[PDB]
A paper describes a structure:
[name] from [name] is a member of the [name] family, which have been implicated in regulation of the stress-response in bacteria. Functional studies have previously shown [name] as an essential regulator of virulence factors in [name]. Importantly, the over-expression of [name] negatively regulates the production of the two [name] exopolysaccharides, amylovoran and levan.
Two different crystal forms developed in the conditions used for crystallisation; rectangular crystals and rhombic plates, with the thicker rectangular crystals regularly producing better diffraction quality crystals. [name] forms a homodimer in the asymmetric unit with a solvent content of 60.12% (Vm = 3.08 Å3/Da). The protein contains 3 α-helices (residues 10–20; 67–82; 115–138) surrounding a 5 stranded antiparallel β-sheet (residues 34–35; 47–53; 56–64; 88–92; 100–106) with the concave surface facing the solvent and flanked by two protruding loops (residues 27–33; 93–99) to create a channel. Half of the dimer interface is characterized by hydrophobic interactions between the bent α-helix and β-strand of each chain, while the other half of the interaction face forms a hydrophilic pocket containing 18 highly ordered water molecules, and is capped by hydrogen bonding between the two N-terminal tails. The carboxy-terminal 17 amino acids of [name] form an unstructured chain, accounting for 10% of the protein sequence.
Numbering used by the authors:
A (entry chain B): 2 to 145
B (entry chain A): 0 to 144
Write the structure that this text describes.
Amino acid sequence: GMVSLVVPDLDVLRRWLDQQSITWFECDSCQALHLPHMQNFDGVFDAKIDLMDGVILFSALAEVKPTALIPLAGDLSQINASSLTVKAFLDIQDDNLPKLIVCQSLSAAAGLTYGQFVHFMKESEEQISMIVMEAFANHLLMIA
Amino acid sequence: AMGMVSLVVPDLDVLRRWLDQQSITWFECDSCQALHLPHMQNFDGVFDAKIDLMDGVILFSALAEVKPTALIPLAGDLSQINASSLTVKAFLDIQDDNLPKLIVCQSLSAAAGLTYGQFVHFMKESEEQISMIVMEAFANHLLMI
């Protein structure tokens, strides 16, 4: 049948997460909707929903072992090639543990439907969790 | 808030039609199911671009050939290239028989349905983001002719 096509803002996303019974919290310092259930996957210290220039991003963050940083940076092509949708890259700071970011995007500027968002939440959770769990099994990550 | 639509799950024929409606030329390899996109070869570096449909996901990918001397440096900048776009991915495909390739790509998840307008948005945003990545790598002398 027919469905509403909507250009969403963060309130739309929050309501759509409630409609899925997916729990979210906020950071006071940050603009994302954080997803506590993703910390049930080993290696995940945070996961979140951002909205940035009309694109939705679901990302998960893992802390990387300093000794695995170089082998991981050398695995990035194969990790990115392993998923049709998910992408993985490193975020390295001078003040902190290096981070693996594993993320999927959904472009929202031409409108989305609720069902498209639901599918996104499920496909992303699956594809993201797979990469991060694999990295955890390969002894690359710190326990959260 | 732009109204009611009816979504379609496209197959490859749907995508052919949708590319026809945007007057985007495509053609078919003897040896893939990808819809190749000649117009992408007008961006320096790009030796091939195509659309694939696989397991309910559309992929718009461009391929460029990387100079052997730029391979390690490019391997080192992948995180930054992937962090620089909200939607495009980039990775290396290296064979013993050929030159290394840089693969720059964007996906559109199709299995829950799409409107034609979403697909159009995808082609325009993919082209823009892919070309930006490939052009910058060309400018930085990482690619072959």
